[PDB]
Amino acid sequence: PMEEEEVETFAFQAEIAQLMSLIINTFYSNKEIFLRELISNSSDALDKIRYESLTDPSKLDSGKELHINLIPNKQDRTLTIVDTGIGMTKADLINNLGTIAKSGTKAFMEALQAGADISMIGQFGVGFYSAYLVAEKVTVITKHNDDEQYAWESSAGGSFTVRTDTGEPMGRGTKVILHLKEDQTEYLEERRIKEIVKKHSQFIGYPITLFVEKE
Ligand SMILES: NS(=O)(=O)c1ccc(CNC(=O)c2cn[nH]c2-c2cc(Cl)c(O)cc2O)cc1
Numbered sequence: 001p002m003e004e005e006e007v008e009t010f011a012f013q014a015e016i017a018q019l020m021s022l023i024i025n026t027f028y029s030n031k032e033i034f035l036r037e038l039i040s041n042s043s044d045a046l047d048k049i050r051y052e053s054l055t056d057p058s059k060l061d062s063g064k065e066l067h068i069n070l071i072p073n074k075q076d077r078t079l080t081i082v083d084t085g086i087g088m089t090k091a092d093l094i095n096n097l098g099t100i101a102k103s104g105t106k107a108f109m110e111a112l113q114a115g116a117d118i119s120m121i122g123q124f125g126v127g128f129y130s131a132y133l134v135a136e137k138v139t140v141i142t143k144h145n146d147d148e149q150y151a152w153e154s155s156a157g158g159s160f161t162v163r164t165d166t167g168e169p170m171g172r173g174t175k176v177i178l179h180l181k182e183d184q185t186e187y188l189e190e191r192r193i194k195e196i197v198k199k200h201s202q203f204i205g206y207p208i209t210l211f212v213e214k215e
Helices: 014-025 033-055 090-099 105-113 118-124 127-133 182-188 190-200
Strands: 008-011 068-073 078-083 135-143 149-154 159-164 173-180 208-210
Touching: 008 090, 014 105, 014 127, 033 068, 033 078, 033 118, 033 127, 033 173, 033 190, 068 182, 068 190, 090 135, 090 149, 090 159, 105 118, 118 127, 127 135, 173 182, 182 190, 190 208
Parallel strands: 068 208
Antiparallel strands: 008 159, 068 078, 078 173, 135 149, 135 173, 149 159
């Protein structure tokens, strides 16, 4: 029978919306740094659970291994980045991925409009948004201990949605699904992914595995 699901639609904070437009509608070379930002964001979450579990071992009930998986899908044109970090509560998602102002947004847009390399985005504290260099739509699935699993999604244009996720359960962590733009499909190629992880993500303190579908 028919199922019902609640959705909540949110507006991006004004300067965050402006940044997204700037990222989306301006040409940048060096778009590859998007993956560095995602792995760094995963690494941040992995540190958080690592140290939490030193206090309370019953925070690792939801899964012991701390790692990152990269999953390209050439048929769907998606690149999926999965971690077993601390995850996000509903309030974490809404606040941290779009509604609360970030202190670095205006500085970064100013820097960028003066010719700064897009690679600086991480240092301005808004690196998540680099996903929109290569992705037309981003879905973030997340599971925090003692909260339910949520899905966040945005195609930009100034809004995002959040809903309880009735899809495949994750133990704990965050899964980012990048629906890549048509001219950005090189980031589905095994060689290219290896190249950029090597160049930009070599000092990560957690194992990363690349899963490649049989050609
Ligand atoms: N939106 S933003 O300001 O650029 C941003 C958002 C999140 C982060 C760091 N990551 C986290 O805080 C976190 C906590 N639990 N899960 C995450 C997480 C978030 C993101 Cl965006 C991710 O791609 C992977 C994650 O594991 C850094 C910067």
